[PDB]
């Protein structure tokens, strides 16, 4: 198993209400967990616990190895688009091209005379929200890691572009990788190995899409 939570309860503040309550799941190496639920349900907090920023008050957690985290808030640092995507990681042409293709950024980049050397975050180019999200996703996917934590990475994308990048990036390019994707979209839950739906800190549902089907 790559990630386990067993009976996990946690608090951001002593004597507050728990942000996560008796949470249980298991991800095997290479699987995809979809994490869903309304705003404030505790999804990002769950990722924060995996990254060691929040410790459990009850329960046990297992995870090992390097993490790559894609925030739900996309961000750019001053530098070229290539520098923003590799972001201090060693460069490989094939790997870089595979990521930007999977994130549909080849189309955007091809339109600039400077191509991958277009400068971001320095007042010149103003990127759309969807561009900034795809760049932030590409950065997280380019990093080599054992566990990918993708927190609602499809911000500002139309539903078809989201579907295409979910398939090309999360399902195909990252097929061998252990992935936790915070998402509410039906196809993402359907293709996930496991689904965890949170509501106000609690496990609303945990299982497979097919199991949820059989309750209807």
Instruction: Check residue 39 for interaction with ligand DTP (CB under 6 A).
Output: yes
Least Å distance between CB 122 and ligand DTP? 29
Query: Cα–Cα distance between 133 and 72 in angstroms, integer?
Result: 8
Exposure string (b/e) for 9-43, b if CB count within 10 Å is 16 or more?
bbbeeeeeebbbbebebbbeeebbbbbbbeeebbb
Q: How far is the CB of 201 from ligand DTP (least distance, A)?
A: 7
Contact between residue 196 and residue 174 where contact means Cβ atoms under 8 Å apart: no
Q: Which of 27, 44, 147, 165 binds Mg ion (CB under 5 A)?
A: 44
Binders of ligand DTP in range 62-101 (CB under 6 A): 72
172 is in an annotated binding site: no
Q: How far, in Å, CA of 144 to CA of 67, rounded?
A: 9
Closest approach of Mg ion to the CB of residue 151, in Å:
6
- As measured in angstroms, the least distance from the Cβ of 52 to ligand DTP is 13
Is 39 one of the annotated binding-site residues? Answer: yes
Spatial separation of the C-alpha atoms in residues 31 and 198, rounded to whole Å: 19
Q: Could you say which of 45, 104, 183, 203 contacts ligand DTP (CB under 6 A)? A: 45
**Quick one: which segment of 44-52, 56-64, 107-115, 140-148 binds Mg ion (CB under 5 A)?**
44-52
Residue 85, beta-bridge partner list: none
Residue 207's alpha-carbon distances to 74, 193, 195, in angstroms, are: 30, 9, 6
Binding site for ligand DTP (CB under 6 A): 12, 19, 37, 39-45, 72
């Amino acid at each position: 198993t790559e990630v386990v939570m067993e009976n996990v309860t946690a608090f951001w503040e002593e004597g507050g209400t728990p942000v996560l309550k008796d949470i249980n799941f298991k991800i095997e190496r290479g699987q995809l967990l979809a994490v869903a639920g309304s705003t404030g349900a505790g999804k990002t907090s769950l990722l924060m616990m995996i990254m060691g920023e929040l410790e459990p008050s009850e329960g046990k957690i297992k995870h090992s190895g390097r993490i790559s985290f894609c925030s739900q808030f996309s961000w750019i640092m001053p530098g070229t688009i290539k520098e923003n995507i590799i972001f201090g990681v060693s460069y490989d042409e094939y790997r870089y091209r595979s990521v930007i293709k999977a994130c549909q950024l080849e189309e955007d980049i091809s339109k600039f005379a400077e191509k991958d050397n277009i400068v971001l975050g320095e007042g010149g180019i103003t990127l759309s929200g969807g561009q900034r999200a795809r760049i932030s996703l590409a950065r997280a996917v380019y990093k080599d890691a054992d566990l990918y934590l993708l927190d609602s990475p499809f911000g500002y994308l139309d539903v078809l572009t989201e579907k295409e990048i979910f398939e090309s990036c999360v399902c195909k390019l990252m097929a061998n990788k252990t992935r936790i994707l915070v998402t509410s979209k039906m196809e993402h839950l359907k293709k996930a190995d496991k689904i965890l739906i949170l509501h106000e800190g609690s496990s609303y549902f945990y299982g497979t899409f097919s199991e949820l089907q059989n309750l209807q």
